[PDB]
Amino acid sequence: PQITLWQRPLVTIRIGGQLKEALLDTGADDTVLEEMNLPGKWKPKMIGGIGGFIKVRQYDQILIEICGHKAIGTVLVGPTPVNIIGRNLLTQIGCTLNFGGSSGPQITLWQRPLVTIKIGGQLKEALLDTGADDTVLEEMSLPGRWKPKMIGGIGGFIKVRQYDQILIEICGHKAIGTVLVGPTPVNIIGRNLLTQIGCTLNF
Numbered sequence: 001p002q003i004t005l006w007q008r009p010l011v012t013i014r015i016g017g018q019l020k021e022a023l024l025d026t027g028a029d030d031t032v033l034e035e036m037n038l039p040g041k042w043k044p045k046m047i048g049g050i051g052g053f054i055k056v057r058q059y060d061q062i063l064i065e066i067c068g069h070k071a072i073g074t075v076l077v078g079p080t081p082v083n084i085i086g087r088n089l090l091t092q093i094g095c096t097l098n099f100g101g102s103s104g105p106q107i108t109l110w111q112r113p114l115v116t117i118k119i120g121g122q123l124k125e126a127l128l129d130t131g132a133d134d135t136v137l138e139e140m141s142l143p144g145r146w147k148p149k150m151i152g153g154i155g156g157f158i159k160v161r162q163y164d165q166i167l168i169e170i171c172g173h174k175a176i177g178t179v180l181v182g183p184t185p186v187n188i189i190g191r192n193l194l195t196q197i198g199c200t201l202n203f
């Protein structure tokens, strides 16, 4: 199958005899599920994201079915707004990112999908992130007017500066779109620019 990124890549998993909805997320190392009470023992863990850390419980060897495909791995359970399928499970279902309509350059998720971007006129690297609505870069100087905005993620909300109609080159592809600038741990390329450069998920 192929998943487009016009929408959030939400899918049905099953985890127990339960269907759940979850987000297919290439920028997440880990898989995070909403609070549910599993039998088993767990380890305490702190995970971070945009706006800070939350505490989670780590369960090992959970089996999930993602789109008729089985995966077995570590899941973290906690007060997440959304169930996130991270690269630890996505690699097991054979999921790749493909640019150019389909293979096309093909990117595996065994490691973090980091690429070089050129943004006026520096090179940075950024994570290709199918779970993000928006593109968030580290603090930099872009020419143009901006406005304050707030965005959130795991851990909460950050204040960003929004610039519209900015040119960016992602792997030699041009995109012209909105970029948020603020105190993000990582440069994130989200669905707003991913779609411009013809990125899909395939398995």
Ligand SMILES: CC(C)[C@H](NC(=O)N(C)Cc1ccccn1)C(=O)N[C@@H](Cc1ccccc1)[C@H](O)[C@@H](O)[C@H](Cc1ccccc1)NC(=O)[C@@H](NC(=O)N(C)Cc1ccccn1)C(C)C
Binding pocket: 008, 023, 025, 026, 027, 028, 029, 030, 031, 032, 047, 048, 049, 050, 081, 082, 084, 112, 127, 129, 130, 131, 132, 133, 134, 135, 136, 151, 152, 153, 154, 185, 186, 188
């Ligand atoms: C779940 C965590 C275990 C995960 N963290 C994580 O993997 N690490 C910290 C390790 C790491 C380090 C360096 C590089 C890569 N990975 C995480 O938050 N990953 C982010 C990307 C990120 C990595 C590192 C630092 C900061 C961010 C996700 O991949 C990213 O897609 C998240 C997912 C998300 C979405 C909704 C709610 C919670 C989490 N989106 C976001 O944080 C964006 N927000 C949204 O898009 N929304 C809140 C809208 C929305 C609503 C509903 C559904 C989806 N999206 C920001 C960037 C604008």
